[PDB]
Design a protein around this ligand. Structure first.
Ligand code: HDD
Ligand code: HEM
Ligand code: HEM
Lengths: 726, 726, 308, 83
């Protein structure tokens, strides 16, 4: 027996904070977290303990360490069917990755509405607040491969599969409210331009290259989502701390047949929070799995990701009431003009068991709707509807991908479709066609109705000639980017300028950079001049005179577009590094850990080596990581308790820890002799907003630090950071 | 509701004779026939009655008759996800057919041994007479595609999957005891030569073409299995009336570790029976699904196919005691030298529910052995072990083909293999490698032992240099063909001659016919002369003087090599055509039908049209088929009862029915005025052996006809048939 | 050398009547018959005469009769890459057959218009009577698999690929001028009804079974093409002796932008001819490849299929 | 076979040999080469047995394995010399 005597190889099946225990398959970590979808998966879950090792044909294996050979130094024999099965399986493990959003992290949970929405939709999952719908959600980046890094600058995907009693509804959204392009015909062009360039397949996970900006400079429709991608929206702190949006206007249809236009939103109950660019990029090297790890560990801790589903509802008669087209997916609906109605809450409370079986093989498709919802003529949505069925044919091997366990509906499904590769279901129906008499026409069509009825499209009037032509109403490109820009805080605006400046600096052909700055001058002169200055470009007299685009329906700004404008920070689930020394003041540590525990904030005890240190009163404190092993990039704030500061005071890694946190605008707290460190980050003797300091770590020191943490970062510190060499 | 109100759309769930009821899925025809495998398939069986029609995502469909369009005469819209799911699934229904044995028919059943074989093999399925093992068997042809005809001249496959408690064992055999070639390296050449020629893909289901006989003429090792394919072995009456053989010498290993060489046999309990060529060839047009149909309907009628498993056992010390090499798959082991020891019985007693899901996707492979069995160095067997795992990667879409329901073991299977296309099992093991400590090394290897132990290969000694060389002991080609020839009856020999003659007459290049005739002269001068005379070829004096090959270990014949030399007739499950007229003698028909029913022989009542006819006493007689609709090819015998014979006496189809049955050597019985048909087949007044005739169908008439049916055909009629124009 | 000394293994590269010579690949039977498509395929045509037998990696093979073993009666060794490449190729020869029209026979040829049709269409292949367009045509049955018989009762497919200067135009028609159903949404229902029944996969190449007539009796829109199929149109004598039809109304668009509705027809210049049922059904037994053979041999004989 | 779609992956341009390659293998997904050989098997007379095996030799010969001596039982065992 190879497991250690003490059983420390196995994590406890109870919630534990990040790093306390090795992570595990969800059904082992949380065996009593149940929902109807997780329960239906029991028929395919396979255990292991106490079973014999076998071939796939059930034959017990005696020696799993050697090939069959003629003599123990002889040649391997073709009759070794154990070796061949095992190698053949391995040789075929991989399937094609997703064309876009290949990199993603997924979890199970459930959804429940706050009230019946039957006045606006007959969708069964929205019909009663006691209706619980299991979900599986996958969050993703867009551009990079399945093995690229999490904290890149990118749009993020936010796909939710609702397993309803009336079919699977997939809400396949992103973390920004518009897309880059207007018509699906252009999708392969836009995606080719953003993906690694075809000759050499560089760069991975970055839009910072010539072909992306070439396309943007030639297609001004892109500029709105480009603004969002260059803002800190492009670098979220966590998939728990970003918004989601369906982007398209869809329709809700009620039992009376009335259609209401709807745009879908997810509001993060943990608040909105993003990284800063230097932190994000460095973190792609120090932990490329940071967001995947954070999501898994949040759920292991009981810090469940929670989102409120929201609807923007516009009556059919208000179709043409705005100065933009509701069907244009490059336009957002400002919340100031159409508020978001909060309709339900989704809680992700269990990790998968096997990443490939449940996450990699999950198939989400926006065409998967249910009675009570309907599409619109948004021409990007229209083209999506073709792609997500088609792409699964190659990615998941054929047309029976709905029989892969994670994709199966939990409600009944019966029809006349048969065969195809890896057909699981064995149909007993005498008939495989309809109409038929030989099975009395079963399974049978169902008329549309208020509940449990068949799907009928809303009978929208279509009048026009067959054309390949963009609606003139879509031909406005600068007013929403400007609305976005004006709605950001001045620090958010600086981060946008810096995002454009950094990316355009990586464009080798300078005329592309010039053409992009010219586009910025159509949006906002301040933004254009700031970027231009960072690129060594001077705006012409003509560019300085471009008339700003008009306001959006009399809107000057909308603070709901800013990440930070309106306070909504939550500290539960965040993490603080505590930098130890070899003789820590245990009185400090007791107070710190107590205050953090009360607010659900986690801690990581860091030192210059692994093992344990001993506190002044003999308490043994287990070390989680070294200074270099768990960089400040991975935490939200840093606390340095009192004790033997000479032990770390000249530790390069300890000093650098605080300089990096400082640079990235993180709260820092220094107790007693830890205040020696003020010299490394150049803090004046009478203190500075964002640096908590006291004689010791009492309860008043912790409240200050926790208050800074609720504001996320110390934005007032930005003009001081240019000086620090970190 | 489109079913007839009387309920006649639905077959009775009880055994019923062929043609009495529409055929149906196994689980609907025979719901109470169960075995452990059939039960384990319940998790994937899908019903239909009383369910709503849905998409594959579970969304009810309202209108399954129309695409979504703009106006009821307008264009179809891309947003119709219901049409596109349905057509996408149809568009991808087909998977590649099997490279060889693509045409096949399958059933479920069970196996039980007569006694424990613990003394000679530790195989669990052979350990206890009370141990029942479910099986699935597929019978097949070899050359034609899955849409080719059943009653071609070909070898047939007989593949059995035994779902044992210690793993799947697949016994993948043919209906002749040898193969065409000696070394697997030649398999693609041989198969390419027999398959349709590559420029024009002709001929389907036939070896009667140039490239096949070219290869034969150049590779004399093929002659033995060619003799068998040219015999009436190549055209079996049914899958129930052929033998099966695993061909290769394998090993049995007991718990003391002793190896015994074994060849496997299946003996058909229904007896051995074949068609004649003209009948077989015409039947491929009148009913290209004749064997598939006959198998299905036998099982529906309760005439379960039964076979007895037998072993030829040779002690390890006797490996070299024969004139031929035991490892050479072109050599049989005569039952006169090594008798077949009866081992157990297999009964096939339930049809599949869905042919694609269960038959088309079943994967058999002779590498699938269990502890207790092992391989030998037979060089054809050795290459087979490579091919059957490789080919499923494309055929069945990836390395998870064992998770396709029909292929699943019923015993436990656990290992460290993960992922692959279409992965069903969700593994919860923390470890995907061994050795591991994090799951205490589970699942674990199992030492070999007497029951439930791990697989270990028998430690055969290997000694030799690495060579691509045929053993000299394999270099003998003519003695086994001659033993086969000499063992046949004289009418069997005539059919062999006619087989070679017919096939070679299709070879366009005359020199190939000449080269084959030369090979035949090395086997037997009588055979070579008689084929030569049919091809207009004169043997040279050299050919006339070739000395015959030696006997096989002193044997000049072995009657177990003949289909007919030892009577083994069984009438149960056979079928008689009854040719009605419009005023049948009901007394005759009472006597005929009840005598057939008493022996389990089926009848089909035929007439010049469908519907009913009324007997002399008013009994209403339902007609099964017309004389042209169900030709004599499809029955074993023909009875014409008395009545108004002038009604059919002038009917060309009725007369031709008898002439065809007569030419094909079937028993014919004529009652009363039916004897007027004697002039049609040119029977003398005083009658002839093989024609039953009387004033009425009473006394010994039916007993006589049944005695003829038991001898299968009237071989003594062969000289009398050459002159009849039919 | 294995060939006969008289050279009788090799067909004459001249037109010959059916049966006079073994049949052969087109480029060997008629090396001088060319067209722009045929020529373009020269980059991938592979000969054989005078070349060494090799692996797919170009390594010459010394012994293609034996596996590598440890002693001549010993086990086969895994390091035999020659054996495994050859068997791996063979094991993966098959690809899925077509969902419908799996059974089909094809030939190369050329088309040219009798006069310019520029007044009614701007299609380049119809613009000039002296501009030739290569074609590739496949004729087919509908229901049976790729190994089913040719002279079944069925509708026949007649598909033409025109390799034009402005792109490929495929005219994908059948031998009757209508189809069985009105809406594509019903195609899987109809096809499943005509195809072998799903429990036992019977019957092959035949609409003569319950599910097909069940569908017909419940969908009277099928009756028109069913009448066609039950007539002698259902059992053509040869692909050379049937009509073709595009079935649907399409549009022609001229340079001025005017649209004209059009239905397409092929007229067999060999005339229309069918078998009779008893003959057709017996021929599926005696020669299940009869239409495939007849087409190939008409072309080898110079009896080229012509259609207007 | 899964990665590159089937058994014709040596026909993908970067994989192709620059020297001659000829044999009797046929078909497979994505088959590019169009074989004109009347025979797809050997031995054949109909194409005078081309393409033909080549004896091993000093240059341009067929591949023959070195005739290394093999001696021992069929075992799943690590050589003690590896431990
Ligand atoms: C080196 C290749 C090779 C050789 C020498 C053989 N086979 Fe084979 N056989 C195959 C390669 C193969 C295969 C390509 O792997 C098939 C086709 C698809 C499949 O699953 O297995 C197959 C299928 C196949 C089937 C159909 C199984 C089913 O119903 O699915 C039977 C009954 C046999 N074979 C029997 C034999 C016998 C009795 C052989 C000689 C003693 C033999 N085969 C030699
Ligand atoms: C509105 C802009 C769009 C958004 C927000 C969007 C969102 C997404 C998301 C979130 C995923 C990943 C789902 C998962 O987690 O598995 C996805 C995958 C995909 N999308 Fe869309 N998408 C958009 C536009 C398109 C368009 C216009 C097309 C086609 C023209 C498209 C084709 C695909 C394909 C092919 C995949 C891979 C899906 C799979 O392989 O299962 N995307 N997209
Ligand atoms: C109007 C009546 C129809 C005619 C004349 C027609 C014609 C044909 C023909 C001639 C082929 C064979 C092409 C070849 O030689 O390879 C074919 C194949 C096919 N047809 Fe159509 N068809 C018709 C209706 C349809 C409909 C309505 C659908 C779809 C709903 C359809 C789907 C297919 C598919 C999937 C194939 C196989 C193609 C391939 O695998 O390459 N058929 N059809």
């Amino acid at each position: 027996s190879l497991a250690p005597e003490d059983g420390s190889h196995r994590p406890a099946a109870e919630p534990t904070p990040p790093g306390a225990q090795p992570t595990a398959p969800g059904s082992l970590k949380a065996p009593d977290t149940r929902n109807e979808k997780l329960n239906s998966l029991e028929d395919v879950r396979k255990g292991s303990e106490n079973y014999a090792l076998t071939t796939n044909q059930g034959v017990r294996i005696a020696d799993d360490q050697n090939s069959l050979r003629a003599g123990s130094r002889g040649p391997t024999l073709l009759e070794d069917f154990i070796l061949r099965e095992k190698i053949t399986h391995f040789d075929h493990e991989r399937i094609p990755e997703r064309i876009v959003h290949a990199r993603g992290s997924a979890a199970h949970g459930y959804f429940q509405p706050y009230k019946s929405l039957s006045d606006i939709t007959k969708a069964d999952f929205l019909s009663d607040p006691n209706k619980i719908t299991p979900v599986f959600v996958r969050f993703s980046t867009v551009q990079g491969g399945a093995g690229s890094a999490d904290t890149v600058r990118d749009i993020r995907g936010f796909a939710t599969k609702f397993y309803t009693e009336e079919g699977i509804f997939d809400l396949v959204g992103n973390n920004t409210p518009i897309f880059f392009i207007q018509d699906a015909h252009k999708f392969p062009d836009f995606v080719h331009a953003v993906k690694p360039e075809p000759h050499w397949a560089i760069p991975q996970g970055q839009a910072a290259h010539d072909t992306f900006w070439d396309y943007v400079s030639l297609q001004p429709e892109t500029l709105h989502n480009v603004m969002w991608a260059m803002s800190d929206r492009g670098i979220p702190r966590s998939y728990r701390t970003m918004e989601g949006f369906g982007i398209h206007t869809f329709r809700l249809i009620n039992a009376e047949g009335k259609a209401t236009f709807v745009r879908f939103h997810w509001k993060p109950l943990a608040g909105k929070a993003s990284l800063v660019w230097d932190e994000a990029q460095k973190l792609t090297g120090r932990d490329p799995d940071f967001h995947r790890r954070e999501l898994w560990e949040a759920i292991e801790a009981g810090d469940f990701p929670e989102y409120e589903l929201g609807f923007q509802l516009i009556p059919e008669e208000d179709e043409f009431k705005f100065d933009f087209d509701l069907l244009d997916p490059t336009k957002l609906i400002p919340e100031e003009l159409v508020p978001v109605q909060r309709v339900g809450k989704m809680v992700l409370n269990r990790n998968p068991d096997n990443f490939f079986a449940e996450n990699e093989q999950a198939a989400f498709h926006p065409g998967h709707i249910v009675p009570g919802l309907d599409f619109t003529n948004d021409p990007l949505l229209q083209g999506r509807l073709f792609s997500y069925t088609d792409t699964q044919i190659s990615r998941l091997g054929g047309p029976n991908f709905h029989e892969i366990p994670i994709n199966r509906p939990t409600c009944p499904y019966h029809n006349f479709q048969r065969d195809g590769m890896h057909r699981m279901g064995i149909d007993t129906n005498p008939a495989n066609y309809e109409p038929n008499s030989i099975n009395d026409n079963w399974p049978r069509e169902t008329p549309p109705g208020p509940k449990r009825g068949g799907f009928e499209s809303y009978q929208e009037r279509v009048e026009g000639n067959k054309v390949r032509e963009r609606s003139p109403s879509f031909g406005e490109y600068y007013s929403h980017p400007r609305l976005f820009w004006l709605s950001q805080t001045p620090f958010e605006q600086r981060h946008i300028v810096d995002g454009f400046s950094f990316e355009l600096s990586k464009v080798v052909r300078p005329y592309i950079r010039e053409r992009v700055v010219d586009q910025l001058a159509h949006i906002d002169l301040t933004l254009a001049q700031a970027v231009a200055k960072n690129l060594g470009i001077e705006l012409t007299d003509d560019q300085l005179n471009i008339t700003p685009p008009p306001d959006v329906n009399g809107l000057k700004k909308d603070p709901s577009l800013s990440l930070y404008a309106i306070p909504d920070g939550d500290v539960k689930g965040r993490v603080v590094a505590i930098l130890l020394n070899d003789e820590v003041r245990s009185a400090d540590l007791l107070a710190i850990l107590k205050a953090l525990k009360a607010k659900g904030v986690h801690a990581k005890l860091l030192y210059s080596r692994m093992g344990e240190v001993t506190a002044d009163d003999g308490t043994v404190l287990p070390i989680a990581a070294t200074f270099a092993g768990a960089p400040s990039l991975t935490v939200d704030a840093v606390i340095v308790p009192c004790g033997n500061i000479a032990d770390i005071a000249d530790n390069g890694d300890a000093n650098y820890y605080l300089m990096e946190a400082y640079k990235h605008l993180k709260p820092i707290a220094l107790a007693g002799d830890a205040r020696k460190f003020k010299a490394t980050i150049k803090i004046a003797d009478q203190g500075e907003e964002g640096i908590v300091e006291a004689d010791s770590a009492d309860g008043s020191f912790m409240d200050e630090l926790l208050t800074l943490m609720a504001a996320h970062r110390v934005w007032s510190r930005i003009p001081k950071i240019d000086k620090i060499p970190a």
